[PDB]
Symmetry: D2
Subunit: 97 residues, 4 copies
Amino acid sequence: MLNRVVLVGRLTKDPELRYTPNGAAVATFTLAVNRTREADFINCVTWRRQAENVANFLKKGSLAGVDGRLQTRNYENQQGQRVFVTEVQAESVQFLE
Amino acid sequence: GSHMLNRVVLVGRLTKDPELRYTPNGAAVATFTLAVNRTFTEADFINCVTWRRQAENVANFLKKGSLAGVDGRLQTRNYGQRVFVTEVQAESVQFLEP
Amino acid sequence: GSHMLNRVVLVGRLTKDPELRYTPNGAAVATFTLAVNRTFEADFINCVTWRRQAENVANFLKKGSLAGVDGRLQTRNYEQQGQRVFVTEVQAESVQFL
Amino acid sequence: GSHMLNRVVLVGRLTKDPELRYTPNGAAVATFTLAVNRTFREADFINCVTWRRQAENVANFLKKGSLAGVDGRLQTRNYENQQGQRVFVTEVQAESVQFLEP
DNA sequence: TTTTTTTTTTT
């Protein structure tokens, strides 16, 4: 089924890079997309080489554009309430700089 | 400063039947959840929101299990005590019925 | 050549059956034109698909079939019965059958 | 109309300076061309169109070589040239435009 | 070369 997202925002913090147990790179960051002035804070996830590149070139405030899909996943917080997360599985990231 | 790109396009089935209510300011608002299938081994559940006439059409022609595609922007709302809502503000809703 | 954002998504009906060709090296390529209605006027976009996706288009899509495409927007050069033409097509990375 | 689903998002460089004309109604119309790079022909030439205030800002802010991001629809066209052959044209109806240069 | 839900904003 069709599922496509395209965003252009500024990173709110430095991209946070980590590695899975079996070595897969995982870069995460939060784009602040200006509204059509407030903005929306969307969370994005990157994998493998695209994640390592996000780490070496993006930082707080950098302008960037993502292209991916919307994901959801259940979560149980310390307060007990079940939370719904929505992320952007960015398959491509353009550095606008 | 100025605006920034923000576009979303989904095609999924409604988990429930769309719920229509009228805003205190008089505007119509219909909500519904699309279940778009994942491309691998099973589905994501995106919250959609549409307004005014597009909302009145959704409530009349879409029900649970209906296939539909939306075209809007991704916005994060904030307000069961403190919920961080991530939803699609649907500007268009296409009915994929017979 | 650093990459840039290039995304297209459409839902339309084939103007005719998809024509299946084969690359000199043996790759499957299927083309078709989608009629994306503005109203019930329409736009007629040309789409190309490759490898397994061209196989499925050829097997599961005929004229008037509702289909969704997701891909890039690329230009192309070829010859019709004379001078060259400069077309703009949609490289369907994924095609949903409806 | 824009009833069935149809959306385009592009980011490219202007190949030529924008062209601003005015329609019978006196409304603003801006036409420009983007060079959308490939990821290993190495770029794609896409024609764009915008209207009204969105077209005024294009002619003022954007010049040849500027980096721009458009969001709109696909719209087709067919005309007969002087050679007597029916040409077919696709171009983006840029609803939204974002300026990206420094 | 074409396929088969939407309306005004009113001097």
